[PDB]
mmCIF file of C-alpha atoms and ligand atoms in Angstrom:
data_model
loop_
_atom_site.group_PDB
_atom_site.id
_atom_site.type_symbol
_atom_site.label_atom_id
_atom_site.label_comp_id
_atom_site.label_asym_id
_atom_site.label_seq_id
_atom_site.Cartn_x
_atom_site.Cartn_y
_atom_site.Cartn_z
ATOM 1 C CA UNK A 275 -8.195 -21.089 88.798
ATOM 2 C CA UNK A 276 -10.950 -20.802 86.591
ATOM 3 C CA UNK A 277 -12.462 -23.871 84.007
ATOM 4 C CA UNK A 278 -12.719 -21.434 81.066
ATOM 5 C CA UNK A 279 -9.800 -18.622 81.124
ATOM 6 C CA UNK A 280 -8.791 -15.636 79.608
ATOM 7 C CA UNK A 281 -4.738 -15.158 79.565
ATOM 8 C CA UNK A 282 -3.696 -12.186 78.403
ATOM 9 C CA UNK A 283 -0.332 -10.634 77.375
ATOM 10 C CA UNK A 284 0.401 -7.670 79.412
ATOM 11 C CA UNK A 285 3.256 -5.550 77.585
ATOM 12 C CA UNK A 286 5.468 -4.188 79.893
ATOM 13 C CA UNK A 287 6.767 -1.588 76.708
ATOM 14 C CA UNK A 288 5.033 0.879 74.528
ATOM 15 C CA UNK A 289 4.713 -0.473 71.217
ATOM 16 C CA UNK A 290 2.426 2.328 69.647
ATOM 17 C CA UNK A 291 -0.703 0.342 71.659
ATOM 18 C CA UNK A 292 0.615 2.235 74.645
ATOM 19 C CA UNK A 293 0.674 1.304 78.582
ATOM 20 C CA UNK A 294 -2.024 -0.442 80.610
ATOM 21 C CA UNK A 295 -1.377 -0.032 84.303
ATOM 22 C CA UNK A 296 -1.890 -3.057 86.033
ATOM 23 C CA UNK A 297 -5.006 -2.023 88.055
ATOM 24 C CA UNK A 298 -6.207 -0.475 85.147
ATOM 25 C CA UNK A 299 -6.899 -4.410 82.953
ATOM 26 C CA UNK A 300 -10.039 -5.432 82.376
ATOM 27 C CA UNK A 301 -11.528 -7.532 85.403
ATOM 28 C CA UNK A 302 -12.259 -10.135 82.229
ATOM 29 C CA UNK A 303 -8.599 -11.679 82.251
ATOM 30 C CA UNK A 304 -8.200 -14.136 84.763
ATOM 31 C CA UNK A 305 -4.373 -13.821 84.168
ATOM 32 C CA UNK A 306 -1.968 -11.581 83.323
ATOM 33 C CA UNK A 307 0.911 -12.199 81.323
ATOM 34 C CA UNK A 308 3.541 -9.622 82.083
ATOM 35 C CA UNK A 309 5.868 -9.045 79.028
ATOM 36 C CA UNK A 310 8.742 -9.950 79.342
ATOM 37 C CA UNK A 311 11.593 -10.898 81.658
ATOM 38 C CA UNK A 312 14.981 -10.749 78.960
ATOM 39 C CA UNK A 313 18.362 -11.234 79.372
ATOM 40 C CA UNK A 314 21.529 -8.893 78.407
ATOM 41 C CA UNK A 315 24.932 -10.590 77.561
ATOM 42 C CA UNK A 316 25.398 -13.760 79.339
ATOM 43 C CA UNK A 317 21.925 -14.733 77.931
ATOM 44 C CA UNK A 318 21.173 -16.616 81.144
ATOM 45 C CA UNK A 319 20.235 -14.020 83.828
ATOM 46 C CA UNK A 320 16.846 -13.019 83.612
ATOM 47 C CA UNK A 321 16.027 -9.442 84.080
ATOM 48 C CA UNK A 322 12.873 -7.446 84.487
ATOM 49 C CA UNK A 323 12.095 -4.006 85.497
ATOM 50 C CA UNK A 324 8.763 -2.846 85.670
ATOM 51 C CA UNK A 325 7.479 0.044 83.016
ATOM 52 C CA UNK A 326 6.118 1.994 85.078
ATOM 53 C CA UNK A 327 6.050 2.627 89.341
ATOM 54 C CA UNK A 328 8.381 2.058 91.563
ATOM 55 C CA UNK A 329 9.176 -1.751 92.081
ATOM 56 C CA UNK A 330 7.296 -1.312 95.771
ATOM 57 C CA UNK A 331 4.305 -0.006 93.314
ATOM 58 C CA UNK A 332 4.216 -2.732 90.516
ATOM 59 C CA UNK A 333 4.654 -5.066 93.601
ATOM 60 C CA UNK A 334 1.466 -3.725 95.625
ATOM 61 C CA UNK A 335 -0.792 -3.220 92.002
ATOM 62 C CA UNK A 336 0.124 -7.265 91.397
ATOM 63 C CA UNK A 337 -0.721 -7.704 94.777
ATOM 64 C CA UNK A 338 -4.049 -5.957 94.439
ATOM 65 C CA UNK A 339 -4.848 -7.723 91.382
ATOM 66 C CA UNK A 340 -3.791 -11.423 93.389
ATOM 67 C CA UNK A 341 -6.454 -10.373 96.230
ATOM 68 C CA UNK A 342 -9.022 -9.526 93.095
ATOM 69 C CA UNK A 343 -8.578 -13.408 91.856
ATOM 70 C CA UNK A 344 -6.523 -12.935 89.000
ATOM 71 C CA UNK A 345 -2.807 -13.975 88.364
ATOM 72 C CA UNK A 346 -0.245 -12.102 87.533
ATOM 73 C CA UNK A 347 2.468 -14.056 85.706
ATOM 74 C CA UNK A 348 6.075 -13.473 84.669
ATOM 75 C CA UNK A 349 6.591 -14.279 80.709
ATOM 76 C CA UNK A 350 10.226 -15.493 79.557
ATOM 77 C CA UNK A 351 11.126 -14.575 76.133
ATOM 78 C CA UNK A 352 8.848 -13.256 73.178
ATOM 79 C CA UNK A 353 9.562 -12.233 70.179
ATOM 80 C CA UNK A 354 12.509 -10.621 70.861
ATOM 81 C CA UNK A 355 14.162 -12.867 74.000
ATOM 82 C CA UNK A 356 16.847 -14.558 73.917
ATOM 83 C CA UNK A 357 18.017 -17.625 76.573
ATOM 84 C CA UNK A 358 20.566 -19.922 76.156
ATOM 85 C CA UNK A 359 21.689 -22.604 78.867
ATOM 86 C CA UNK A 360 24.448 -24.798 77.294
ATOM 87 C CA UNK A 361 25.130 -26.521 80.570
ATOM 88 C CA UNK A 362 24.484 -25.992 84.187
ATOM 89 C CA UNK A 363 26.454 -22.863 84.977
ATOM 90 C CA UNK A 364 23.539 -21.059 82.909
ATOM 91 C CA UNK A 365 21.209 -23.232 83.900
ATOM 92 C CA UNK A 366 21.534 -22.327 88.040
ATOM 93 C CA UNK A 367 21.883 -17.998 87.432
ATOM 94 C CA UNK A 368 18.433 -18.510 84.634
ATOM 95 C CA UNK A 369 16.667 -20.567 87.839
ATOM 96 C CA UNK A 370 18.362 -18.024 90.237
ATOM 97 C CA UNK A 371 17.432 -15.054 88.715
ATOM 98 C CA UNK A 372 13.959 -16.142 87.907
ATOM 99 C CA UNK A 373 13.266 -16.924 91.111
ATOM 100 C CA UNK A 374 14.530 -13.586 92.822
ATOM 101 C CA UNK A 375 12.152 -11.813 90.467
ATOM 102 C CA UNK A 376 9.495 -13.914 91.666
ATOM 103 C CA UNK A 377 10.218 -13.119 95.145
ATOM 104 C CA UNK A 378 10.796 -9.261 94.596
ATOM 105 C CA UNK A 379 7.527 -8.765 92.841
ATOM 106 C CA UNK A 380 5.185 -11.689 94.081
ATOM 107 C CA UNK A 381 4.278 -12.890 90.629
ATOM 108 C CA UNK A 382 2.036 -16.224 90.836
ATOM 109 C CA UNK A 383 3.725 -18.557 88.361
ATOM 110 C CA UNK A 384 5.837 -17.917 84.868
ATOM 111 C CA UNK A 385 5.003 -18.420 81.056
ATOM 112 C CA UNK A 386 7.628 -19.966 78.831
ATOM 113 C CA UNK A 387 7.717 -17.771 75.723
ATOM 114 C CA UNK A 388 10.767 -18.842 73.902
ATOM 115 C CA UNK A 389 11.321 -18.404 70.435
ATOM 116 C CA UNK A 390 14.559 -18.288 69.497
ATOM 117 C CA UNK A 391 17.464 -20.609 70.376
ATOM 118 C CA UNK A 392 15.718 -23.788 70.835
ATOM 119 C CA UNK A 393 16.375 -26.600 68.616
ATOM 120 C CA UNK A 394 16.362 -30.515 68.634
ATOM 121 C CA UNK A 395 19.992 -31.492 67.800
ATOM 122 C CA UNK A 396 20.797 -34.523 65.658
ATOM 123 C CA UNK A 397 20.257 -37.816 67.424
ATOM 124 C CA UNK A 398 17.777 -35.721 69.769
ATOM 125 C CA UNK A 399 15.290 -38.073 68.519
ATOM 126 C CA UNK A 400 12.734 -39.004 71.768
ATOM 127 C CA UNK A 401 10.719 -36.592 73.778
ATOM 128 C CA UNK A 402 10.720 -38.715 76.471
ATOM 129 C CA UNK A 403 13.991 -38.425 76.909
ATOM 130 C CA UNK A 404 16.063 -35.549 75.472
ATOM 131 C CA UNK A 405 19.513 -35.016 75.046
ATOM 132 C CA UNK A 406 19.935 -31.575 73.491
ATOM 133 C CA UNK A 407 21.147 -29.690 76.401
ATOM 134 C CA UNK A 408 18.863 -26.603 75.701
ATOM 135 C CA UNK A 409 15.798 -28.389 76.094
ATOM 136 C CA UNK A 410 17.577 -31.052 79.235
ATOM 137 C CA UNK A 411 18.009 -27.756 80.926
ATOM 138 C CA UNK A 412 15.497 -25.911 80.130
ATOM 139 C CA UNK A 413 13.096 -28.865 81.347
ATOM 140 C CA UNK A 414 15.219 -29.073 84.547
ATOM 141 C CA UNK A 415 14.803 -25.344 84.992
ATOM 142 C CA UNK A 416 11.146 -25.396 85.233
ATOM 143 C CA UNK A 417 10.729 -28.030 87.395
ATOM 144 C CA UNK A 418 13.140 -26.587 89.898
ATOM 145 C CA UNK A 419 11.420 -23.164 89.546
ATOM 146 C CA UNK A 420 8.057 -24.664 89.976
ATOM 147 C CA UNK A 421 9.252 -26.320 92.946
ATOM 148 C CA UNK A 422 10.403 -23.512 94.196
ATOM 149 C CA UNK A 423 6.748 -21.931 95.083
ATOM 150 C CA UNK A 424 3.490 -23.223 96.571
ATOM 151 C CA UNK A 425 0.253 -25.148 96.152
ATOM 152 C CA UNK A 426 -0.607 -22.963 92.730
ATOM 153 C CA UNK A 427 2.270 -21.570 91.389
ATOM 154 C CA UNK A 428 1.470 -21.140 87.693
ATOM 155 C CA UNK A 429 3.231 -22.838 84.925
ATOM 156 C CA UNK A 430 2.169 -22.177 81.657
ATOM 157 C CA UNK A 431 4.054 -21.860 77.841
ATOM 158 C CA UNK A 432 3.298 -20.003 74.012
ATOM 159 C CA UNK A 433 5.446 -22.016 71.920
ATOM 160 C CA UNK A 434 4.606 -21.704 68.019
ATOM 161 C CA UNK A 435 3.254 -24.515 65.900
ATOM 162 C CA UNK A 436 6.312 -25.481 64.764
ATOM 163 C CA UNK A 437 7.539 -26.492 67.650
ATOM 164 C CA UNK A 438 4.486 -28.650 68.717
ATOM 165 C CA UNK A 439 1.811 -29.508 66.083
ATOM 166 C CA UNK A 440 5.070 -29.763 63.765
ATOM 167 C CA UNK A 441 5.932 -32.530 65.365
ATOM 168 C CA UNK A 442 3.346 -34.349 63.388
ATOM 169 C CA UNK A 443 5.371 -33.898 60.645
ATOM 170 C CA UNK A 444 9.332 -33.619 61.818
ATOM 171 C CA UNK A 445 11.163 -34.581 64.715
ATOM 172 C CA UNK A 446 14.111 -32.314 64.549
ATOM 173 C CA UNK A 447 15.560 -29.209 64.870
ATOM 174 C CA UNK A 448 12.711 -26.614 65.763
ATOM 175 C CA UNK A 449 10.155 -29.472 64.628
ATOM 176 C CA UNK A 450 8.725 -30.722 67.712
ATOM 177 C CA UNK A 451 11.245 -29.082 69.701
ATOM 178 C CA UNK A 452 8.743 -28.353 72.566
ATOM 179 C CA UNK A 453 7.219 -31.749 72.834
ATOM 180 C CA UNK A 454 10.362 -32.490 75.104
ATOM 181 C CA UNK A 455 9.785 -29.904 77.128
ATOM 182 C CA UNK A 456 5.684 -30.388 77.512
ATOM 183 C CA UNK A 457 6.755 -34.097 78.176
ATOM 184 C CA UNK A 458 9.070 -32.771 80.530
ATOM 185 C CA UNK A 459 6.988 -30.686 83.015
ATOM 186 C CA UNK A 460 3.438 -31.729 82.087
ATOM 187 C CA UNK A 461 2.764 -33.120 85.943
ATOM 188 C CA UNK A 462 4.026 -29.199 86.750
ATOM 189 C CA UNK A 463 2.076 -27.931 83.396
ATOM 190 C CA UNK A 464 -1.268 -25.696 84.050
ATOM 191 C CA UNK A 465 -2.020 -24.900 80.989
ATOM 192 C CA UNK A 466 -0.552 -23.880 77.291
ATOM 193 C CA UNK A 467 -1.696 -22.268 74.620
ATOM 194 C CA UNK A 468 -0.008 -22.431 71.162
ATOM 195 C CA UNK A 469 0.474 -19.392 69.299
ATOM 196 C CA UNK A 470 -2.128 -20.278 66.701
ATOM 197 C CA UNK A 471 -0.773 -17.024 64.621
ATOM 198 C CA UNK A 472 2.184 -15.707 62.242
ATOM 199 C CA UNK A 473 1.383 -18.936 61.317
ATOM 200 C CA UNK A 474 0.601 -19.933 57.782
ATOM 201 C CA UNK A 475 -0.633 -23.139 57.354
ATOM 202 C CA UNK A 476 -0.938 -26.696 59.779
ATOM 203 C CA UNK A 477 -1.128 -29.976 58.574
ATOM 204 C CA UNK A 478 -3.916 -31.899 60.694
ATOM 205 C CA UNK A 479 -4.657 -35.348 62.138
ATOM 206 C CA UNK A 480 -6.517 -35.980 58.999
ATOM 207 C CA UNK A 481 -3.424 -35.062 56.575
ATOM 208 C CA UNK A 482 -5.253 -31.700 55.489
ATOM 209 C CA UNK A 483 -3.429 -28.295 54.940
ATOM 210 C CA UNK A 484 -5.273 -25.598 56.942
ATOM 211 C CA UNK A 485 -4.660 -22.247 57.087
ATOM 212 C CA UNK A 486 -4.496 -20.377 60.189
ATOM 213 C CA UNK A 487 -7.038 -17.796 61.096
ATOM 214 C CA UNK A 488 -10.003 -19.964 60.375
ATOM 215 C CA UNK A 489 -11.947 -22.224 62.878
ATOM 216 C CA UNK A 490 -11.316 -25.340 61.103
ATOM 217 C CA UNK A 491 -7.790 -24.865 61.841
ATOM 218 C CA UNK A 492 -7.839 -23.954 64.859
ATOM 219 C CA UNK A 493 -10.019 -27.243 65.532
ATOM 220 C CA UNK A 494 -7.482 -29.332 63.883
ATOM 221 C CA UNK A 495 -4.603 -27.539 65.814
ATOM 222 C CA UNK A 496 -6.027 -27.875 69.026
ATOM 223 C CA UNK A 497 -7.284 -32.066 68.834
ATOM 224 C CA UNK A 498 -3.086 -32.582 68.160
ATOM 225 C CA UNK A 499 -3.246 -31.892 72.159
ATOM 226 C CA UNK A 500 -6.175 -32.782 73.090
ATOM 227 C CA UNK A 501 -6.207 -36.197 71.046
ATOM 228 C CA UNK A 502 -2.565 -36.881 70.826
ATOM 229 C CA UNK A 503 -0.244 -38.052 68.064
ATOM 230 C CA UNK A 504 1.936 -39.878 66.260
ATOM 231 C CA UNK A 505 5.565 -37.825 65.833
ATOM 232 C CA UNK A 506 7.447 -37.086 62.618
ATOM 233 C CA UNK A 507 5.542 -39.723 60.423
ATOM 234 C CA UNK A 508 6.242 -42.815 63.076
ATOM 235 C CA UNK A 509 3.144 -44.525 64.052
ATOM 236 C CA UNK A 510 5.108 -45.852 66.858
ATOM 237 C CA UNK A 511 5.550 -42.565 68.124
ATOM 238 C CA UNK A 512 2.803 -41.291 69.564
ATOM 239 C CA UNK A 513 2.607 -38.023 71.865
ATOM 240 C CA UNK A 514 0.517 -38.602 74.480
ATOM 241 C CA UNK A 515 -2.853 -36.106 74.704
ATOM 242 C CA UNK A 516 -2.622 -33.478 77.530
ATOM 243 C CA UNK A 517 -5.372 -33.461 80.176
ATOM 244 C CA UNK A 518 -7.718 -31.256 78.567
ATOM 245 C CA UNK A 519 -7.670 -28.566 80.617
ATOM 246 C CA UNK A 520 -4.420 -28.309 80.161
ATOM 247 C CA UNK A 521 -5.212 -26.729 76.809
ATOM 248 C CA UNK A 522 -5.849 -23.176 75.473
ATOM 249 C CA UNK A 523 -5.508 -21.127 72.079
ATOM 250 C CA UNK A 524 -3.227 -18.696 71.613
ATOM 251 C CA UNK A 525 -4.703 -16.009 69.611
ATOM 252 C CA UNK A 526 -4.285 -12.438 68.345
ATOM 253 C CA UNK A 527 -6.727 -9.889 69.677
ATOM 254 C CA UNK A 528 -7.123 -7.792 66.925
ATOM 255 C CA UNK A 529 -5.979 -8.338 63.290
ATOM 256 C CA UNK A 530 -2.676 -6.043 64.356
ATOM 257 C CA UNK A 531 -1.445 -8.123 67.026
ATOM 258 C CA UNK A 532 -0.098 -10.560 64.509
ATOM 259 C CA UNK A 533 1.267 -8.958 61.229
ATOM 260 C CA UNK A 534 1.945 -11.658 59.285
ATOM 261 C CA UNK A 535 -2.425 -12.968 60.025
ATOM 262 C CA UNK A 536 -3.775 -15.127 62.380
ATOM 263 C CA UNK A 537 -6.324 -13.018 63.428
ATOM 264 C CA UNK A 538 -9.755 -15.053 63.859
ATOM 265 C CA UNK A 539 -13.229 -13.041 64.305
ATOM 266 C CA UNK A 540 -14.928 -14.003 67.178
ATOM 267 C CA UNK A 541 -17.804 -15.292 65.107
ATOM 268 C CA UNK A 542 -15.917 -17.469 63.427
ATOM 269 C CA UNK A 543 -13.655 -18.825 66.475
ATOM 270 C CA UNK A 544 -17.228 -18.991 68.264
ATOM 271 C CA UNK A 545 -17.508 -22.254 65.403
ATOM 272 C CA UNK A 546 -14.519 -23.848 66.605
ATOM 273 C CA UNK A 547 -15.058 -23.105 70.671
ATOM 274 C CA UNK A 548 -18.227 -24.985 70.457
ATOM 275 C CA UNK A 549 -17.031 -27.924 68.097
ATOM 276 C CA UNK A 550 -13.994 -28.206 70.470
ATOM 277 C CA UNK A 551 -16.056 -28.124 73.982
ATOM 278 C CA UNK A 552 -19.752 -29.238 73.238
ATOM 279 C CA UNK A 553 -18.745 -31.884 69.624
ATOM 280 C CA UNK A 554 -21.082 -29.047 68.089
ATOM 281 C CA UNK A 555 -20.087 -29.189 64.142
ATOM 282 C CA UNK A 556 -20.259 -26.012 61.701
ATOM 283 C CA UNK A 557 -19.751 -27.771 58.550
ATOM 284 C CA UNK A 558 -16.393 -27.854 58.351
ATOM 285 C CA UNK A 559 -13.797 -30.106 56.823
ATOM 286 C CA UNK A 560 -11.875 -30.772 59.696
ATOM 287 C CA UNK A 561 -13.597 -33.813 61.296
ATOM 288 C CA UNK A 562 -13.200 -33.568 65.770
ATOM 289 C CA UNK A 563 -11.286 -36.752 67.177
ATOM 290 C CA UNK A 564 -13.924 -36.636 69.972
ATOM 291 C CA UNK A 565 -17.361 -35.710 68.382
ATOM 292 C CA UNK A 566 -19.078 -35.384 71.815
ATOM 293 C CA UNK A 567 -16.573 -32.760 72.239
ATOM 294 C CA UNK A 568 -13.904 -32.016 75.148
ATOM 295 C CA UNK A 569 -15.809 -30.270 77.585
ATOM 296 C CA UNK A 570 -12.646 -29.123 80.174
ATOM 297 C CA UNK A 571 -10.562 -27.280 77.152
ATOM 298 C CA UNK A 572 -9.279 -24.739 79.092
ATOM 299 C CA UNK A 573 -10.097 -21.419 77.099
ATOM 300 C CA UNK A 574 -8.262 -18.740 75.485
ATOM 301 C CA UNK A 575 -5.008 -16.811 75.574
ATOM 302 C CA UNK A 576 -4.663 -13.294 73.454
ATOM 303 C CA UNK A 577 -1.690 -11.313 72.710
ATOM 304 C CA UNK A 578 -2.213 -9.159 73.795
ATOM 305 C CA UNK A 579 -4.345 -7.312 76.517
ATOM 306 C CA UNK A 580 -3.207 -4.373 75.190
ATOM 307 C CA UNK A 581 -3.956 -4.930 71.661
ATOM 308 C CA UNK A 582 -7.758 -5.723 72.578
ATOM 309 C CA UNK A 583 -8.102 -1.797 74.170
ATOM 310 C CA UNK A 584 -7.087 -0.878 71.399
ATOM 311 C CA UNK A 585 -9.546 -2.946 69.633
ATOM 312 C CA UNK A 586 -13.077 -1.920 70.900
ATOM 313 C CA UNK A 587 -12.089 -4.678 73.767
ATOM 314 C CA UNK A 588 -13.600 -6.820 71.120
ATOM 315 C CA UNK A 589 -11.516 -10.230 72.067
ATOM 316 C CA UNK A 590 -11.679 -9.987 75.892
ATOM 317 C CA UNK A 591 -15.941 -8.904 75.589
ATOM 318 C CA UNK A 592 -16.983 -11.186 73.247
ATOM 319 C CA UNK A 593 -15.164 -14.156 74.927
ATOM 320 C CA UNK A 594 -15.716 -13.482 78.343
ATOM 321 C CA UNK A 595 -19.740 -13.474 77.654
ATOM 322 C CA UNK A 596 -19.110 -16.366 75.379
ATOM 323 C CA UNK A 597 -17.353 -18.831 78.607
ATOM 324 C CA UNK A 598 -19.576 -17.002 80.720
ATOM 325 C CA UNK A 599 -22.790 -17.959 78.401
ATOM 326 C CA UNK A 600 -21.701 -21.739 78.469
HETATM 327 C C1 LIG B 970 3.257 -14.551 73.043
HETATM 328 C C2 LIG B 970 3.595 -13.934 72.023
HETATM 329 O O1 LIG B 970 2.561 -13.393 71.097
HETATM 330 N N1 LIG B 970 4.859 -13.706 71.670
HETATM 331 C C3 LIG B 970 5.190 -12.907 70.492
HETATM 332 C C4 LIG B 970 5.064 -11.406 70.777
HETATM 333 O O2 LIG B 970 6.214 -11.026 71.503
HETATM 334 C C5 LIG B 970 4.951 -10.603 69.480
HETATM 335 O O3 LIG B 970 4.599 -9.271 69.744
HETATM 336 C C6 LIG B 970 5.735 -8.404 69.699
HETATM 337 O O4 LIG B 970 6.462 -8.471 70.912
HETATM 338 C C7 LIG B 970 7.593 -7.615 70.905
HETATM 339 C C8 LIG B 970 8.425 -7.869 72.157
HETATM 340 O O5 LIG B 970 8.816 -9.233 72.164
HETATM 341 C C9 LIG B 970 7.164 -6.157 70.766
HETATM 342 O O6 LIG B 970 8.306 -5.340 70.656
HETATM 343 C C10 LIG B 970 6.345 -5.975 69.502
HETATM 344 O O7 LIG B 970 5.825 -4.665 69.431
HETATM 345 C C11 LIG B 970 5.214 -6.986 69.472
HETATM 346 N N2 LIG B 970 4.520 -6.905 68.197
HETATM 347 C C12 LIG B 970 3.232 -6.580 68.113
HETATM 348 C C13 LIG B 970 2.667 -6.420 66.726
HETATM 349 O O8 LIG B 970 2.517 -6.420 69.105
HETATM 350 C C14 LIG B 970 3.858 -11.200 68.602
HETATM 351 C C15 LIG B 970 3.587 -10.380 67.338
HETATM 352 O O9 LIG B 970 2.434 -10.871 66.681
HETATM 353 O O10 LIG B 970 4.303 -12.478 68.231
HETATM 354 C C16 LIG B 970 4.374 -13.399 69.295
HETATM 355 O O11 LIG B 970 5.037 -14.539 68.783
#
């Protein structure tokens, strides 16, 4: 795996942006997010038929693409999944089920994308050690997936803000609810990347309101990870930073991929890439944690991949020559 990365979302749908065939992605991701395995009634039993080929001919184009370098990755959830393990019934068929898909198409790791049904229950209170049995589950889940596979299976997550840099302000309910679960599987963890979009506005390390869609905040949302932080107001409680190339930016590719903004032009997010890697300022108000910079910051995710063909390619171009040009 590559020091600078482009994930992309891969939808396996057609939401008006129409299909991509696998072999048919830009060379420019270095992984593929396929979207998205779902569940039907017992909310537990992950399921996940391919758009288009036979399953032998989604199988072979993911193999192609594995012998090209890139990784091809199953995503849980989005916008519209749903997975609930209350206890360990649901836990063992979502583990089950993940892994047989896994094994039937030959996908190289999976991306946690839930956004819906995960909350921090009252008295739920340290992410060291959770009690909510959601997140206990979920957290056991992953590991046992993970160690399911080899040397570099992929484990990677898209949680929003909320659920993460929230934490900096509440511990509770969906505020922080994903800290847990970080905590949980970091020594498993190879990257995430935070949906820094449908966003609004995140508080940073320096108590400043930012607004999504402009570099300073996505500086200010990134250092949470790579710096660390205290949780929900306790100075006692501090998150610990991930390595930093454990950390990416989720981001829309074009100003369509994310309705309700987010969007960032690649000028602009240029500003915060360098500030973030090289400690390179661009006048803004949001002051780095590191001012030399933290040079291993993984890179970029997008949703989606098919968004930025739609889009004059403009998010997977101008950040591939970007990493590239470092
Ligand atoms: C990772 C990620 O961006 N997850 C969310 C996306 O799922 C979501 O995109 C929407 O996904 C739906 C399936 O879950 C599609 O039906 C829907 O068409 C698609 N919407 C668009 C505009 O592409 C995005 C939307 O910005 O939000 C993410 O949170």
């Amino acid at each position: 795996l590559g020091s600078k990365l482009l994930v992309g979302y891969w939808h396996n749908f057609d939401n008006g942006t129409g299909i991509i065939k696998l072999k048919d992605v830009s060379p420019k991701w270095d992984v593929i997010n396929v979207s998205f395995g779902e569940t039907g009634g017992d909310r537990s039993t992950v399921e996940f038929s391919p758009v288009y080929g036979t399953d032998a001919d989604f199988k072979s184009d993911i193999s192609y693409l594995k012998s090209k370098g890139k990784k091809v990755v199953l995503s849980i959830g989005g916008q519209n999944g749903v997975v609930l393990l209350p206890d360990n019934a649901a836990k063992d068929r979502f583990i089950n089920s993940i892994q047989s898909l896994i094994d039937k198409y030959g996908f190289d790791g999976i991306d946690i994308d839930l956004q819906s049904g995960i909350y921090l229950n009252g008295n739920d209170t340290n992410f060291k050690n959770p009690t909510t049995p959601q997140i206990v589950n979920l957290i056991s889940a992953i590991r046992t997936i993970s160690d399911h596979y080899g040397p570099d299976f992929l484990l990677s997550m898209a949680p929003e803000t909320a659920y993460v840099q929230g934490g900096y302000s509440a511990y509770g309910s969906i505020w922080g609810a994903y800290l847990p679960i970080i905590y949980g599987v970091k020594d498993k963890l190879t990257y995430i990347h935070v949906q820094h979009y449908n966003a609004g506005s995140g508080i940073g390390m320096d108590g400043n309101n930012y607004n999504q869609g402009t570099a300073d905040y996505e500086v200010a949302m990134a250092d949470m990870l790579l710096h660390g932080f205290p949780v929900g107001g306790n100075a006692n409680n501090i998150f610990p930073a991930l390595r930093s190339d454990q950390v990416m930016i989720g981001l829309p590719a074009a100003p369509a991929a994310a309705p309700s903004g987010g969007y960032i032009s690649p000028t602009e997010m240029k500003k915060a890439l360098n500030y973030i890697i090289k400690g390179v300022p661009f006048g803004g108000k949001y002051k780095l944690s590191n001012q030399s910079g933290y040079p291993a910051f993984r890179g970029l995710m997008s949703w989606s991949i098919n968004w930025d063909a739609k889009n004059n390619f403009e998010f997977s171009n101008n950040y591939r020559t970007y990493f590239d040009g470092l």
